[PDB]
Amino acid sequence: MRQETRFKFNAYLSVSKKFTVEPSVTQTLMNTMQESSDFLTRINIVPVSEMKGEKIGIGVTGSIASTTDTAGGTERQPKDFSKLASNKYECDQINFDFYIRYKTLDLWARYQDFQLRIRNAIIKRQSLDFIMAGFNGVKRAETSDRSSNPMLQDVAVGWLQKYRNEAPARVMSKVTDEEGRTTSEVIRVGKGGDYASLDALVMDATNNLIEPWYQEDPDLVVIVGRQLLADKYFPIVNKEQADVIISQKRIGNLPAVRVPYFPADAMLITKLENLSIYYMDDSHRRVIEENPKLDRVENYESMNIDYVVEDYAAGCLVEKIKVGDFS
């Protein structure tokens, strides 16, 4: 439709898993950071060349077929191919900034091969930081302080908050009644609670909430923290009588993965290629400084990113889970 795009389409007429445009520095750094960890491998880190606009669709499927009597009657109105619920992403900047003291710098520089170790260390410290900030982080507020927000809850809006304030009716936070708007503030799961066990929970959740299309899919994952998983699998091992059941770690007929710093009282069921992060093409600005006022060598780096779930009707999350007995 545009000049180059019209040419490419006319040419269409007459690895395919990740997206590249041109070899630059920020793309290379992002690719390195992805290859570092393992969880970033199973996710889409997309470079975009715009400050605000439309998102692309990945793993979206909609039934497109019908039959119409074109012979003397109505016409054929085609259905849309990529029409999602709501799609408007807004990329924003976040920046890291640190310093090394002269003493520690000298101690490290004494031995050989220190630059490579420092590079690998900062890359590893950065990737896990992306994850931790993404899964937490209700809202973004300028001049973020790390006094009362140690879990990094103020950098940018995360996937969970995206689900919370962008597409409600896909979350579960209370047991209610037609007269009792809050019959139960917390979803008790136990012998006497509102469920039998986590299996029935994830089962009826994946039955009711998510759409019938993705419901029948060869790929679904139940992202859950570490406290809840261990709380479920501990009473199994604490018995007297088969140990393979600790290797696969399936719950509710669905494979389970665990990511660090995930909130303990919630779990999100979705396909692992549906959520993604977008980053501006060339915004990785990095500067050094060697001020002696505090005898420290400091550095600043800034990058423009934005987390985004592609199709909100893909997965759903349950929040405020509490296991007990409730006699």
Q: How far is CA 39 from CA 124, 135, 254, 269, in A?
A: 12, 13, 18, 16
Q: Among 7, 13, 29, which residue's Cα sits nearest to residue 286? A: 29
What whole-number distance in Å separates Cα of residue 44 and Cα of residue 50? 17
Tokens representing 235 are 């009473």
Instruction: Read off the tokens for 198.
Output: 């986590």
CA distances from 70 to 64, 66, 73, 74, 76 (A): 18, 12, 6, 6, 7
Q: 26 or 149, CB closer to its own copies?
A: 26
Q: Shortest distance, CB of residue 83 to its own copies, whole angstroms?
A: 7
**CA nearest neighbour of 280 among 49, 44, 56:** 49
Strand partners, 101: 296
Is the Cβ of residue 98 or residue 108 nearer to its own copies in the bound state? 98
Q: Please say whether the beta carbons of 249 and 19 come within 8 A.
A: no
DSSP for 8-40, written as a single string: HHHHHH---SS---S--HHHHHHHHHHHHSSTT
Q: Which is nearer to its own copies, 70 or 147 (CB)?
A: 70
Q: Which is nearer to its own copies, 76 or 181 (CB)?
A: 76
Between the alpha carbon of residue 170 and those of residues 2, 162, 164, 199, 314, the distances in Å are 38, 11, 8, 19, 10
Of 129 and 281, nearer to its own copies (C-beta) is 281
- Choose between 81 and 111: whose C-beta lies nearer to its own copies: 81
Q: How far is the CB of 47 from its own copies (least distance, A)?
A: 12
Least spacing, CB of residue 74 vs its own copies, in Å: 9
Q: Which is nearer to its own copies, 221 or 280 (CB)?
A: 280
CB of 64 to its own copies, least distance (A): 5
The CB-of-193 to its own copies minimum distance in angstroms stands at: 21
If residue 199 lies in a helix (H) or strand (E), which one and from where to where? helix 198-208
CA torsion angle for 234, 133, 209, 82 (degrees, to 10)?
-140
Between 41 and 93, name the residue whose CB sits nearer to its own copies: 93
| Shortest CB 7 distance to its own copies, Å | 13
Q: How far is the CB of 312 from its own copies (least distance, A)?
A: 5
Closest contact distance (angstroms) between CB of 39 and its own copies is: 26
